[PDB]
Design a protein around this ligand. Structure first.
Ligand SMILES: O=c1[nH]c(=O)c2[nH+]cn([C@@H]3O[C@H](COP(=O)(O)O)[C@@H](O)[C@H]3O)c2[nH]1
Ligand SMILES: O=c1[nH]c(=O)c2[nH+]cn([C@@H]3O[C@H](COP(=O)(O)O)[C@@H](O)[C@H]3O)c2[nH]1
Lengths: 296, 298
């Protein structure tokens, strides 16, 4: 794979497919979407509008990171929607994982379609990677956009090589995949502000320590989950946090590798010392199969 | 340097004299302390000792059968076994408070034991009280004279006394086990389904830890059924129970820590649990030292 070649080629292919129309892209902060947004911006400048929807379920500091990288550094038109209270209010009382997924997917695409209308987008750019067993698209309230997918034939490692070349920050280039529903499926039972806070801070500790250990390039994913069961501490009851770390090619199968004991111990103690209301930290030692990667 | 052989002749002589012709009773927990006091006492007064094993259904897999073979068959003690499984399970229906679990189990055990105490007109309560590292009144009002042959020994001495008395290694070196048993290793309600998971999980843990020769280097190694659920793939996302593995070293009552366990052993225990015990979605390993955690999960 020649990243220099591919960029030149792909910038040219997009400009001609998109021609002079207005395009839109959802920035997750992940690598695939970040790479496609930057390729597209190179191809069409201010015709591109990027949208960041702050669902309140994102990793700590995402909004700022996306602003500083895409708006400040790179100069993309960037629309940011602070939708935290809206997504939290909607999840009040919801414990069914599938109801969480449906609610969050719906609010998300509704806000996205709203912005796409406001700006009269005609093209949707997505960072979809290969393969394609998984072209216009109709959005749920009827708006139709032509789809461009410049990474549609690329794999994980090719795209990491691309983001390097395009000068994206290291935090993006090696960003682990993160779900649409974000932290809401890493907080079992009800997504309260209390449990969401614990979740967000535990995940920041996991990310920081895994980065210090240079395991961010080897691991597929590495995260913390707030379980909806409690255990005892020094005798008071509080939240159990589970750590989840796996290797995988694509998320189809997964194995828990040998994680240095020191690293796990250090995470554990940072979590119980720095985050009030956590009694216990445990580590998931279940492969996929028979487990799924996420806990719900 | 403590002398087991001498202690046995001095103790057996002292037990005979404190007890006399009278009927004595003891609770067998399956632990080393009560096991030793029972055997000493049985050398002193033979058939005047009644040993009681209450099968609460909350003990480790195979416990009743090991007590039978060891104390009735091998040593010839008068053993009564009360099958109280249904009784303890029925009493814990709906009970999710850990304090209340502990209370219910404590008092119900006393009620079964006291019933036997009355039945057989016992006068003396032998206990396995040892040193830190006498009448009692039962609930209905029966009074027992307490005899504590081991009150002065430390755990290390008791263990030496137990080898000399012919007890198996399975008793002598067994990790300590809570009075309320598997009840405090099933979080939330103790249902029959969760308990059965807890029992087999613990048997898998004990077996694998022994096979890897780590029983020596660990204080406690057990499984807990958490009252929360995670996803598992079977065909097209099932919800099932999370089991947690707890392995600690500890040198005093204030502290414990999680040592480095070989990862192959962890993965082995994990893969056995999920493949062999229906309705477990995930196995997690506790990486919290004491402080800030406790050893048990509740
Ligand atoms: O965008 C997403 N929305 C979701 O609802 C969702 N659920 C799981 N995942 C991710 O997919 C992979 C497979 O996850 P599981 O083994 O938990 O099914 C893992 O990499 C998970 O993070 C999701 N991504
Ligand atoms: O006989 C008992 N009845 C109980 O209710 C009980 N709770 C905890 N333990 C045992 O005591 C030690 C310290 O327990 P924690 O660190 O969990 O507080 C550990 O070795 C525990 O196994 C119990 N033993």
């Amino acid at each position: 794979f020649d990243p220099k070649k591919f960029i030149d080629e792909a910038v040219e292919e997009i400009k001609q497919q998109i021609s002079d129309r207005k395009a839109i892209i959802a920035l997750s902060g992940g690598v695939d979407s970040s790479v496609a947004a930057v390729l597209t911006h190179k191809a069409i400048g201010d015709k591109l509008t990027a949208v960041f929807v702050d669902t309140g379920l994102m990793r700590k500091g995402e909004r700022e990171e996306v602003e500083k990288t895409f708006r400040d550094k790179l100069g993309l038109n960037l629309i940011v929607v602070d939708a935290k209270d809206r997504f939290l209010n909607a999840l009040k009382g919801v414990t069914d994982p599938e109801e969480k997924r449906k609610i969050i997917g719906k609010l998300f695409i509704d806000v996205f379609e709203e912005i796409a209308e406001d700006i009269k987008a005609e093209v949707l750019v997505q960072g979809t990677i290969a393969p394609d067993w998984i072209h216009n698209v109709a959005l749920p309230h009827g708006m139709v956009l032509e789809v461009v997918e410049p990474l549609r034939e690329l794999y994980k490692d090719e795209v990491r090589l691309l983001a390097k070349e395009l000068g994206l920050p290291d935090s993006i280039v090696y960003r682990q995949p993160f779900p649409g529903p974000g932290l809401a499926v890493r907080v079992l039972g009800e997504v309260t502000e209390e449990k969401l806070n614990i979740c967000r801070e535990a995940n920041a500790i996991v990310e920081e320590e895994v980065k210090k250990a240079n395991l961010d390039k080897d691991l597929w994913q590495y995260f913390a989950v707030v379980l909806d069961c409690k255990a005892t501490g020094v005798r008071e009851y509080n939240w159990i946090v589970a750590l989840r770390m796996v290797k995988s090619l694509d998320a189809m199968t997964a194995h828990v590798p040998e994680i240095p004991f020191d690293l796990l111990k250090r995470i554990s103690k940072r979590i119980t010392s720095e985050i009030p209301n956590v009694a216990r930290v445990v580590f998931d030692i279940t492969d996929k199969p028979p487990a799924t990667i996420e806990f719900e």
